[PDB]
Amino acid sequence: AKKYCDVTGLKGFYKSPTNNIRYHNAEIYQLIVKPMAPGVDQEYLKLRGANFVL
Amino acid sequence: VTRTAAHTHIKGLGLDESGVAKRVEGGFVGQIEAREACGVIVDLIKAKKMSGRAILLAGGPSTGKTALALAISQELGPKVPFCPLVGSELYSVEVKKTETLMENFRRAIGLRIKETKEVYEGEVTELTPEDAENKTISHVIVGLKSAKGTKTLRLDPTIYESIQREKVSIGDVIYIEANTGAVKRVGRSDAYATEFDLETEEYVPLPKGEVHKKKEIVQDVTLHDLDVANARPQGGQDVISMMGQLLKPKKTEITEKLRQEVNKVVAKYIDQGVAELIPGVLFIDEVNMLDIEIFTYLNKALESNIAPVVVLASNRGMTTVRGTEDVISPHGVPPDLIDRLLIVRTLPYDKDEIRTIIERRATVERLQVESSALDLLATMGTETSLRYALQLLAPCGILAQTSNRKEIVVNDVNEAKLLFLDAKRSTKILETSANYL
Amino acid sequence: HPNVSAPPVTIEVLGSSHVTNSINNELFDPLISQALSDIPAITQYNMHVKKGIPVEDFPKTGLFPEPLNKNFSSNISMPSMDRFITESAKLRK
Amino acid sequence: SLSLIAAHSHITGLGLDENLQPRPTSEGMVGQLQARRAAGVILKMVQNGTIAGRAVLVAGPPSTGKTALAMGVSQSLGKDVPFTAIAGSEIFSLELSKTEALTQAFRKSIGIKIKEETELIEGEVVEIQIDRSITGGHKQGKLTIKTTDMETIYELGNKMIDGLTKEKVLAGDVISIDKASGKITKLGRSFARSRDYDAMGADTRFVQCPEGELQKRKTVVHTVSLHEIDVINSRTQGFLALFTGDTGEIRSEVRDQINTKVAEWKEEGKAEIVPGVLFIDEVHMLDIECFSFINRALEDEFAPIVMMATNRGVSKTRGTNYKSPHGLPLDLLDRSIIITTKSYNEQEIKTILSIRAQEEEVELSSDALDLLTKTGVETSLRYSSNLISVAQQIAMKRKNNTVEVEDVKRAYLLFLDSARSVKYVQENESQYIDDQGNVQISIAK
Amino acid sequence: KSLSLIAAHSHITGLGLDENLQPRPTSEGMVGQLQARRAAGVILKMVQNGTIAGRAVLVAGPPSTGKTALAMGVSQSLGKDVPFTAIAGSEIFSLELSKTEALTQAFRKSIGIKIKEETELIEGEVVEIQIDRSITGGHKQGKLTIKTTDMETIYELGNKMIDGLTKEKVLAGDVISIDKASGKITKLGRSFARSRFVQCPEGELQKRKTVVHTVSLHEIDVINSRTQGFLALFTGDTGEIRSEVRDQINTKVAEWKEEGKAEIVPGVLFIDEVHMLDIECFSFINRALEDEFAPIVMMATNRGVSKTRGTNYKSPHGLPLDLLDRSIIITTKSYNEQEIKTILSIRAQEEEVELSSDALDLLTKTGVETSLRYSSNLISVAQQIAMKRKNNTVEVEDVKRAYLLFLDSARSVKYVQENESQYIDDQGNVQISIAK
Ligand SMILES: Nc1ncnc2c1ncn2[C@@H]1O[C@H](COP(=O)(O)OP(=O)(O)O)[C@@H](O)[C@H]1O
Numbered sequence A: 001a002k003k004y005c006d007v008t009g010l011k012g013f014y015k016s017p018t019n020n021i022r023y024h025n026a027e028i029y030q031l032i033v034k035p036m037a038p039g040v041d042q043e044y045l046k047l048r049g050a051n052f053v054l
Numbered sequence B: 001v002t003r004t005a006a007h008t009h010i011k012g013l014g015l016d017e018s019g020v021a022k023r024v025e026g027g028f029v030g031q032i033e034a035r036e037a038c039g040v041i042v043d044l045i046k047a048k049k050m051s052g053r054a055i056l057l058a059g060g061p062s063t064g065k066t067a068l069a070l071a072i073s074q075e076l077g078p079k080v081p082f083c084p085l086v087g088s089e090l091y092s093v094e095v096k097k098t099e100t101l102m103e104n105f106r107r108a109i110g111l112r113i114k115e116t117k118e119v120y121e122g123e124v125t126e127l128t129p130e131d132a133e134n135k136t137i138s139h140v141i142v143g144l145k146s147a148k149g150t151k152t153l154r155l156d157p158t159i160y161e162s163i164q165r166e167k168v169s170i171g172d173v174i175y176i177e178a179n180t181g182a183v184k185r186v187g188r189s190d191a192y193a194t195e196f197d198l199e200t201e202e203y204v205p206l207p208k209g210e211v212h213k214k215k216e217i218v219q220d221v222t223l224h225d226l227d228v229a230n231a232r233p234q235g236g237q238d239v240i241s242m243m244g245q246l247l248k249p250k251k252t253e254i255t256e257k258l259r260q261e262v263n264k265v266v267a268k269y270i271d272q273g274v275a276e277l278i279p280g281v282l283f284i285d286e287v288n289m290l291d292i293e294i295f296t297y298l299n300k301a302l303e304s305n306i307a308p309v310v311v312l313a314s315n316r317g318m319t320t321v322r323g324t325e326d327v328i329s330p331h332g333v334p335p336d337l338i339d340r341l342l343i344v345r346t347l348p349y350d351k352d353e354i355r356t357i358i359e360r361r362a363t364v365e366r367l368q369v370e371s372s373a374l375d376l377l378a379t380m381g382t383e384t385s386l387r388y389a390l391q392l393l394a395p396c397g398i399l400a401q402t403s404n405r406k407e408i409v410v411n412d413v414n415e416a417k418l419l420f421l422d423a424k425r426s427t428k429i430l431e432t433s434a435n436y437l
Numbered sequence C: 001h002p003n004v005s006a007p008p009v010t011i012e013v014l015g016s017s018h019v020t021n022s023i024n025n026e027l028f029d030p031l032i033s034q035a036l037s038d039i040p041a042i043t044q045y046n047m048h049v050k051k052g053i054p055v056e057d058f059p060k061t062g063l064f065p066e067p068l069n070k071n072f073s074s075n076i077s078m079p080s081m082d083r084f085i086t087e088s089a090k091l092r093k
Numbered sequence D: 001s002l003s004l005i006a007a008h009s010h011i012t013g014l015g016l017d018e019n020l021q022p023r024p025t026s027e028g029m030v031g032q033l034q035a036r037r038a039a040g041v042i043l044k045m046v047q048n049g050t051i052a053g054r055a056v057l058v059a060g061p062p063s064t065g066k067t068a069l070a071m072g073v074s075q076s077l078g079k080d081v082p083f084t085a086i087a088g089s090e091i092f093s094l095e096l097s098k099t100e101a102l103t104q105a106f107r108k109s110i111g112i113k114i115k116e117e118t119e120l121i122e123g124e125v126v127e128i129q130i131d132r133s134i135t136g137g138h139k140q141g142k143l144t145i146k147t148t149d150m151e152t153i154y155e156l157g158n159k160m161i162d163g164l165t166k167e168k169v170l171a172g173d174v175i176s177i178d179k180a181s182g183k184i185t186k187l188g189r190s191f192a193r194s195r196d197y198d199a200m201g202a203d204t205r206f207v208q209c210p211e212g213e214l215q216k217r218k219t220v221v222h223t224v225s226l227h228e229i230d231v232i233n234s235r236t237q238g239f240l241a242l243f244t245g246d247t248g249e250i251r252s253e254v255r256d257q258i259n260t261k262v263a264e265w266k267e268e269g270k271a272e273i274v275p276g277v278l279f280i281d282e283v284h285m286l287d288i289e290c291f292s293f294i295n296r297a298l299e300d301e302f303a304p305i306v307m308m309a310t311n312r313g314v315s316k317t318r319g320t321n322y323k324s325p326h327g328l329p330l331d332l333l334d335r336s337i338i339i340t341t342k343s344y345n346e347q348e349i350k351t352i353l354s355i356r357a358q359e360e361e362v363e364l365s366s367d368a369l370d371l372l373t374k375t376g377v378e379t380s381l382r383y384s385s386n387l388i389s390v391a392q393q394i395a396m397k398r399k400n401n402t403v404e405v406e407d408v409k410r411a412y413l414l415f416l417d418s419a420r421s422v423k424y425v426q427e428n429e430s431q432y433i434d435d436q437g438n439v440q441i442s443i444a445k
Numbered sequence E: 001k002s003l004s005l006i007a008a009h010s011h012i013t014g015l016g017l018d019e020n021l022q023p024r025p026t027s028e029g030m031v032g033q034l035q036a037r038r039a040a041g042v043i044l045k046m047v048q049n050g051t052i053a054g055r056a057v058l059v060a061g062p063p064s065t066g067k068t069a070l071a072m073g074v075s076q077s078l079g080k081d082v083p084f085t086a087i088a089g090s091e092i093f094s095l096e097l098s099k100t101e102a103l104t105q106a107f108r109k110s111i112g113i114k115i116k117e118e119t120e121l122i123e124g125e126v127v128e129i130q131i132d133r134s135i136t137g138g139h140k141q142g143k144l145t146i147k148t149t150d151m152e153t154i155y156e157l158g159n160k161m162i163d164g165l166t167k168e169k170v171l172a173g174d175v176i177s178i179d180k181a182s183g184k185i186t187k188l189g190r191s192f193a194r195s196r197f198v199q200c201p202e203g204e205l206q207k208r209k210t211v212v213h214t215v216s217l218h219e220i221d222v223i224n225s226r227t228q229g230f231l232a233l234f235t236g237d238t239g240e241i242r243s244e245v246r247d248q249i250n251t252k253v254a255e256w257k258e259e260g261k262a263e264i265v266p267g268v269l270f271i272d273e274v275h276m277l278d279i280e281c282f283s284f285i286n287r288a289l290e291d292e293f294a295p296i297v298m299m300a301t302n303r304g305v306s307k308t309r310g311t312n313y314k315s316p317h318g319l320p321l322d323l324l325d326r327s328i329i330i331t332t333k334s335y336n337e338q339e340i341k342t343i344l345s346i347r348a349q350e351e352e353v354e355l356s357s358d359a360l361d362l363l364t365k366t367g368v369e370t371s372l373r374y375s376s377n378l379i380s381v382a383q384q385i386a387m388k389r390k391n392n393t394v395e396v397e398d399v400k401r402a403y404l405l406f407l408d409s410a411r412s413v414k415y416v417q418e419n420e421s422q423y424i425d426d427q428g429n430v431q432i433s434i435a436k
């Protein structure tokens, strides 16, 4: 399956090692993924169906 | 934009259909008799009948002999082979000089082979090798796939061994040519790019065309291409090796037996109508540097049945033949060889045709020159030499450019004349000074 | 012994794995690298007897030229402890 | 079919009678009756093949026909007799000495004849049934060979199984096998089996299925020169050196062994020695070492007849500083019989020009033939022969089939001979580059 | 920079010319020869235009007048990636290559082709690697965490990346560059961890990088000849590359230029002491400049009405009349006292010499009477004499000492001519005995 960016929908070349969120590029990472509040990364992964937290 | 060399302005002989010569056509001006002689010569070459013809062009330096050779070269067209050559190039340190002359002789004879190129492009969806022993695979069934569709092929053991050479797996874009059998692996497909996040497999996209593409080509080879193809001291010319062989092969004396066998095979292919024979022109510029031994071998080799039209050019007068001591001869050509030749004379020029030459080379190199500047350049060309004016067209344009102008005026011409010196003025400076200029 | 030992000049083409595969095939040709070497004896026994490969079907081996002694086998020279005595004349005496 | 019209293509042989008496004009050779009779005598002592190592020299002025008489001798000699026509410039080589070059020419001009007896079975293979031996020794096979006409089944030994496996042969592959010698070939793949496989192999060749009888019988005669045996026996894989030319100074023991076993082969009768003619054109272009080796190397029983041509008068010999007749030392002229040619009158020039016009398909009118005859007797024969073809092209450019006097006059005007070029450069010496490297390129001083 | 000690032409950084091609009196390390500098600037603009091919220019004059200095100014002011080939005249006489084909190699080494290509490259700082070995080793999977100053990511590795990471052992804290297409990893160096050192690279991995390649036509001729690998470019055993591979290359680069994938970069060939070439090499130079893919050839010579090599006669500049007809001649003049003084001051400035004004004037006078290279050799050796007496400044007595110790040309000629019996003459007669 093709991997996509979790917040922007583009080609997700990179995935963060902390919260397992696939992001597009550097601006996306430093503006969204790093300042992301806890408890919403599972909300992002629910759309991909990997809301691991149960 | 295109580069301009010395002979870019000349396109051809500029002759009419009736054989007469127009005064200003084809990049030529004047020289009507030698142009008509070379037109008769190119009609002889296009007749494709006779072998071993020779023509010597006689005339002073800067009279347009190599211009006539290039005009002959374009008049024959790209179909007819042409091997222009300096007379100094025959003296080689790997192989003897006569064998280099005979190599150039074979180089001036060419073939045409019509062949078709059918190819298969796309992704390996399936690869099922059927063994059918009789440990040895009988055949392999490979299915290819592109954007316009898919197509299944049946392949022999040798293409399967070439596939295993290229390390082709399922999902790799390949290249298969049906006639030759070349197998080239372009890379893994784009749909298989996310199996791993990072791997060495170069992911090329799927081809947008049909899998099967067929087109026809024409292969222009010469006889010498064939003789160096099947006479290798160390074989293996077919295998692609980016790093070379461990022993460098040396150029060797190719025997008459291989020439006879290549001639027999080429005649067999022509009699089937596969190949067409196009005789060409071997042009030897500055024949006066040829040794007497090359002249003797040329005397022998102008009698062969497959020899091309040989064009020689010289500018010397009563000169000693190279390699001799007391043999004076016209144009440095020994008198036995000059009986076989047809000498065409080349005349010098005067002021008006020098002016038309200079404005043609101004027009081709797209510098705008003023009229009185052109008259000064023509007068200076008549005084010094022609090629000095031809080589000082471009610094005049440079000095006009640095003064933010597009038209060359007289002051640029005097500035270039003061900066750059001809042979006579530099010789005058050379004679007066004592300490090595 | 030579002063500098150097591998052949590496050609680097950026963006193509076919160049890497072709260069890897050229430098490390399995027929030729198998030719200048030998097969281990356990592999020969496992090949001929266990898998039933005939002896003639083995790839050709042992074609590297034999060096003159064991001393000419490699360019590295081990520091001889016998030479340590003779390095210093005071120590040798 | 590859060969084109040359300067010497009209000559088909010496125009002799059965009594060695030359006809006035036969087989393209005109005149030179004494020279043609001498060449016929040389031809007869070649064809007898009982005399070894004679040197005959052909002497004459230029444009007389020494080369023409030599290649006429070659044409009357026929095929299956070796003939080597080399210039004196081919001797001087870098990796081979001059003496070894003459030895290679001498042994390239003499050969032996070998008879073959072939029983060939040329057919398309249908099936290769293998009868696998339990021990593996003496493997049996059932070959299904099949032409268009008939098919049968053959019995095969172990080594022919090895031969058909060491080169890969399958069903539908055209081969031929000899019964007596066991030679195996692979002609390719039959054209009926071309559409089975969608992409061809790298080496796969398409040949027609054979016709007629399966097993055919034929005898072949092979003529191998002694130099080819010298090349073959020198190296392990020496047949490439027959074609690349890298022989490399074959030692004397090899040639001595080859000579003695060709002699005992003649004794037991498998081979018959066929002598030949070596034609050293322009022999004045040779060193004194070459002349000395030619003198001492003609006294062996395996030495061909040497024909040499010279247009040089009393000039110096190369490699020395003294002048000698014909440019040859007196030792070489001692072991020589000289064929002397003489120049032609206007009738012989007219007939030779007419022959060369009929050879190049040029149709000459009578007045144009007379004008070309006058130009030939004035300047030279070869200038007129070269004028014929350009006169034809000038006539064809004027939309005419035959040549008139005007086309010959225009061809004479456009192209210059040697004498007019000499006068035209002697009149203006300032424009050309002198012997001292002085020239005037300025058109106005 | 490379390996660069002080050479004879090191102070030259180009041609001291304005935008109107007017030479400054002293600029860019080069002083004097105003007409020669303007002519060389015109030739420089002719090269930079690129629309003119196969022109031959000739710099001629007395020795020690700056013809080689002018050529080195042209070479320094060309720039980078425009090819410049400098050969002496005595180099084409080879024992394994013919002279005309060596000239063909020297011609074709100076024409370059310009290809632009883009590649993806991953260059980051590795946080940690983690690879789990299998039960036996049939399949190996592992994870890889790399970072930059901006980004941070985790990668899943297949078989081939793990095999290419075990080879070239990559630890935590390394900075490596990963080529995705060719599978090539290069270790740039260890990052700033105290425990070679290179700073951590900036963000935006998988970045587009454009590398512009300039390859001479001689390399393509050696590559396209299938019997020669690229190792003939370094070992130098090409062995008379044939004409058909060259004409194939000429047509292919022509179709590349018309297709738009490449751009022809013409260059300069400089031949030192062109008078040592022979007559057939001159003939090949005459008929080789006609070609469209030919450089602009600079020849420097000082001989005047000398014999030509391989012929018996004599010709001006040691060159036959047709080659002088094919060429345009730049004449260099000699130097007066002030130009010699400024050259010596520039040379002393580059060789790090602090020298007295009177010692400078003495070296200037020795450079007026005796040729300039004698004084230029004398500065450094006088400076060594100056440090020999522990003085950091070169004085007049150091210059007098260097004059007394190291002889010039004319004094050695006189000293030989007065004592000719001690040496060996043309006939090999020598009187070694000192008395009777
Ligand atoms: N009849 C002509 N018309 C136009 N240009 C000419 C003519 N003759 C010579 N030239 C020019 O003169 C230049 C040099 O001529 P070239 O052939 O080198 O002289 P040479 O015959 O001595 O070799 C060529 O570039 C050519 O363009």
Ligand SMILES: Nc1ncnc2c1ncn2[C@@H]1O[C@H](COP(=O)(O)OP(=O)(O)O)[C@@H](O)[C@H]1O
Pocket: D007, D008, D028, D029, D030, D031, D032, D060, D061, D062, D063, D064, D065, D066, D067, D068, D069, D311, D352, D356, D381, D382, D385
């Ligand atoms: N006997 C002959 N019969 C017919 N043509 C001849 C004869 N002798 C010479 N020729 C003509 O002479 C030309 C070449 O003669 P050649 O053998 O070169 O003379 P030479 O032996 O003096 O060099 C050929 O074109 C050929 O047509």
Ligand SMILES: Nc1ncnc2c1ncn2[C@@H]1O[C@H](COP(=O)(O)OP(=O)(O)O)[C@@H](O)[C@H]1O
Pocket: E008, E009, E029, E030, E031, E032, E033, E062, E063, E064, E065, E066, E067, E068, E069, E070, E343, E372, E373, E376
């Ligand atoms: N105009 C100049 N500017 C700077 N240095 C110069 C100049 N002219 C000559 N030189 C110096 O003079 C020395 C010898 O000159 P050189 O170029 O060898 O003369 P030539 O070219 O005649 O052999 C060189 O070290 C060079 O740097």
